[PDB]
Design a protein around this nucleic acid. Sequence first.
RNA 1: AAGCAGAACUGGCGAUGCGGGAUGAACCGAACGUAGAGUUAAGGUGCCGGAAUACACGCUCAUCAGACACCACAAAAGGUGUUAGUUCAUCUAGACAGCCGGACGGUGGCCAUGGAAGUCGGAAUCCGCUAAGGAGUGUGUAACAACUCACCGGCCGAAUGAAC
RNA 2: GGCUUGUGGCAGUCAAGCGUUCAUAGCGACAUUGCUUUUUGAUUCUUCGAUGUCGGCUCUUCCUAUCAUACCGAAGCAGAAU
Lengths: 172, 189, 136, 96, 52, 205, 190
Amino acid sequence: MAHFKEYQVIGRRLPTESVPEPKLFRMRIFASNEVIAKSRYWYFLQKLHKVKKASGEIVSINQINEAHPTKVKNFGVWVRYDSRSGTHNMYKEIRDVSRVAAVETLYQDMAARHRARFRSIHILKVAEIEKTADVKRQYVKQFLTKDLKFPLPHRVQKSTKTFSYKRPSTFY
Amino acid sequence: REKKAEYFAKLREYLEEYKSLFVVGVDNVSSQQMHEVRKELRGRAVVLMGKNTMVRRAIRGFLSDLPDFEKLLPFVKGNVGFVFTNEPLTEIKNVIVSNRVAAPARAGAVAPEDIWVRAVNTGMEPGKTSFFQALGVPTKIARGTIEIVSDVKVVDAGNKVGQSEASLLNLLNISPFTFGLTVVQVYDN
Amino acid sequence: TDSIVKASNWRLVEVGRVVLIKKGQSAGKLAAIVEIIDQKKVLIDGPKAGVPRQAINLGQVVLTPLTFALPRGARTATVSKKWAAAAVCEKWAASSWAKKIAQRERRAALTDFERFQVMVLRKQKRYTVKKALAKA
Amino acid sequence: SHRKYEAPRHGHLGFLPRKRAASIRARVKAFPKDDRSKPVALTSFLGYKAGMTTIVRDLDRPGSKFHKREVVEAVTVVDTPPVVVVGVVGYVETPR
Amino acid sequence: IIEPSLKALASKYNCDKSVCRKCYARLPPRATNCRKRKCGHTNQLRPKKKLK
Amino acid sequence: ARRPARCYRYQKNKPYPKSRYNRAVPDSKIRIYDLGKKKATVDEFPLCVHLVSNELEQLSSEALEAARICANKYMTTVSGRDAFHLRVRVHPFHVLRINKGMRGAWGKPHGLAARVDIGQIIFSVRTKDSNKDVVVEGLRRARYKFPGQQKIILSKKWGFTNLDRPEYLKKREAGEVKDDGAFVKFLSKKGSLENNIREFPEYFA
Amino acid sequence: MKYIQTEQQIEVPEGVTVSIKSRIVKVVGPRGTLTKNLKHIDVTFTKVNNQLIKVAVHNGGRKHVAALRTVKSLVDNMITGVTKGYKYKMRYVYAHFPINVNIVEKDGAKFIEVRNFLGDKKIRNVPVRDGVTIEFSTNVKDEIVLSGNSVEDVSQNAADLQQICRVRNKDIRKFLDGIYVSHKGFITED
RNA sequence: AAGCAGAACUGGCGAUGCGGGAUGAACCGAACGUAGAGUUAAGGUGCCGGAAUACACGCUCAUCAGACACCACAAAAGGUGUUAGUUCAUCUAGACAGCCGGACGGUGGCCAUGGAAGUCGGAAUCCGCUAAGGAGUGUGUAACAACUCACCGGCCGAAUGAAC
RNA sequence: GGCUUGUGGCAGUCAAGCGUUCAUAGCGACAUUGCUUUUUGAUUCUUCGAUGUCGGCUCUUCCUAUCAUACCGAAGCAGAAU
Ligand SMILES: [Mg+2]
Ligand SMILES: [Mg+2]
Ligand SMILES: [Mg+2]
Ligand SMILES: [Mg+2]
Ligand SMILES: [Mg+2]
Ligand SMILES: [Mg+2]
Ligand SMILES: [Mg+2]
Ligand SMILES: [Mg+2]
């Protein structure tokens, strides 16, 4: 799960005599495999509808590849998480090349800054900020500057040898 | 922006009806002095003030119909106000400049000239002597009142007035500077 | 009588900066920076060397002193045509960095007969150099 | 529990161990700091304790109630015949 | 001779200060938090008590 | 003189009320449960602010009495006596015991505590929107008298009723709301029509 | 937040030459020279047009960006002190015991002595830092003026003379005696 | 309350070594004939010490850091330390800061006071003028006076403030 | 001796009030969070083929929750004394 995978999961109640063709609820789920994606789908239908895995069926599961995985996209993510003392709604912005790598960045950032796990995080929405000046966070907006050029000072070079004979520099 | 909504309409409501505008300065004069200018002139001339960029944005949003208000565009500068009148210039000038001497000098201001106290009978009770004694002013009692011995200068030119040494100036009622309503510009069509 | 400030020139993470990929599947190929994801992540495109258009970490990539004109977000065809217009591969091969890379791979490609020949030729050159040291 | 009553320590811990000296001639463990502008001189001398006696002298101590008054004081006499120089030793400085 | 201007000069350094309500530190008179770590940089301050 | 509240903080025992099997409980320290303008109409005080516990624990009656006094004192000092209706929403029914070897160690009644739960309302105030900050500050000053963690929550209901502000409004321009002493009674679509005409006559227009 | 680029601006007047090595600044103007080692900062200096010098931080946090404005102010204090100088004016405050302040020479050390401070038989002495010129002003009673090229040494020397005349075991709200700083300005300002 | 006393179900120790938890009857893993080879569990891979000073995103600087499943401790309350976020409000129709100007008249508002004139206090808290100025934000006086603030206006020149 | 900390002892948070005026100079009710093991309870894990028992004397060392001394900050600190 070095990469997340985004799946669409379509499920429904079992058809009955009184109610045939149930309503075919569909969700977009981020998971590492189809087993977790189906598990997260039934977890959210337990939060939304009177249905479970025994009273419902999975009619389709498909992997959604990213439409343009080679372009850089500003993302707005709406997320709900549990802290140690309550539940909080949070909006974050990630400048990233795909949706699954932005969800990876969000989970890494949420665990780093709030000590919140995958167990305790609900992804409410991942959307593309299609134009500039709808970007709200300064840490994403600072990369939207025209012809952005920055250096990387203090380059640290990893040697394959225990001993060095040169007193290495950190030029760059 | 609600107060600006009526202020812009009132500003055009005085630009289009009053034929003479008079740009007047305001530096050290009080609300009391604006109140007495109101009471000295109700009906002859109108004082509209509240200098801001409200005025500049209003007049440059009114240059659509009259391009003769662009002369006023550079002149809105300094703590300033407008006077809307129809009466002659050398009469409205005289009525708004005739009232100069306002409330006495405030402690901690820079007195331009040198302030000095003369060797003449002051005219208050001899109990108010520690004010003269604090500055070193020589003092004798004549006919039961303070008379000064010599013409001593209490502060020199280009110096701040002290908080301790503005008290005998307040008692003696010498205030070399408060100034009145000065004017900066005249507007005619 | 003059202000003297040391400029301390640095390689910049910029659009059009040619980079060498030192870790991964490419591992010594050349790519160009097309976008900047964040402080440590960029987007690279190496179509002349066969590098895929990918978002990469700047840690596993070393910047080269070469740069060329490239618009922001240029696609693979645009990156290919402006790479050949700027002639990046010739300017890369002229550098002593790439000369040293080619020298160390030729030394690793030397066989035992060739290492005997280079030792014989090193002795032949050494005799002339030591002779010229004594004359000078 | 505590002493219930506290008294100073019996003896000085900075003179430990109370053992015999390694030689009869006690060693000078520190010398005065060298002022190089002064002429060359000896910093120490060797003598033999002969004995003690008393003196009488006038005390010059202003403020003391025995100012300008005679005091009886014990003095120790050290017999110091002139020492013979027989050698010289040089000392280099080391990180050890 | 008290020279109230010189008295006001010495009151700026000795009298016109603040006091931390926890660690008793003498502080700048319009400070918000005490500068001392041992009180936790608390915002509980008070004016220095004026003489008479 | 009293054993500290750390010995009776958590719901360790089963609920132990005053009953015919206990019969010797001392009186609670909190006796007044409605304060301020308790005769106000429902339309008078639309805003509701709650002090809600975040922990499963026990609140002693002395803590409930002390928090009532300090909250009511602050809101009376700032906004006045009649600007609010403070209702406390927990009652100290559980009886705490004290055992003053371990033979025959069953305890005698020591005091009264209110067993609370996560999300349970401790204090409720209904007031106008004018003094939302006064009520919030009074509730958070009463927060200091309680153990555990408490929260200040602005209710989206109208007053002490169970309807939201827009839902009670829609019922109020219609005739389906009639007033009472301090609460209101709502018209239903059930029952005798003769009664449903006698009360709520402004409806059926 | 790791701001990508944060930079501050240093203006160099005509008589000022500013040579900076790695982090050793040397500023020479009409009044003198001033050197300072900023090796604890980790910033980057660039010269633009011989009258304007930028200093930049790349990828800096809150504390590291906050140090950047400090460095620009310290270099600006260098230029201010090398074309205008620094002049600290201090007044003697006492009630009964007059403070006697003079300049003395022991082994050529240039000390400031303070006698009769609150009637103390102890003589207080503070050294005068090198590059600090001490004068006692005329036509103002009880005034000492400290001037020099460096605001750091002028203010520390003025603060040393202020702190050497502190009152112990007394109400300092009442006993206001001491030499206090009353003005901070420049030498060649007219 | 207890490494306290007493029950229910199950699993253990006792009766049992082995790998791990430095150490330990009960914890984790796994139960054991003698060996060889391989792969693992729990636990780990700077050095002690076998095994990456691995890769990646962040957070933290402690003049008592932290690295504790059982387990060998820490709480309420706080911090413009720093990080991330929620809500509300203001701002180029020149927002927040700093400095500069003015902060009035009825009126020393009605009472109550020994006296309280905006500032011991009770109840009210209205319009006149203005851009604006409270029947007062503080310091003061016995009461005055005086100084100060809210409120607005000179200046720049871009975002800011508050509660969480 | 070990566990616990009701009780004892020592701290803290809030701030109705005291302090002529003023919550916090100094205190501080109603509540409430803690620490310690120099009290006393509670336990009965070690010791009953014995660990000599209270106090005092003597002597050493340690802790800080500091009475004095050193240097400081605050006060309803004028000095002095606190
Ligand atoms: Mg003792
Ligand atoms: Mg129980
Ligand atoms: Mg004293
Ligand atoms: Mg047995
Ligand atoms: Mg083992
Ligand atoms: Mg362990
Ligand atoms: Mg190893
Ligand atoms: Mg024995």
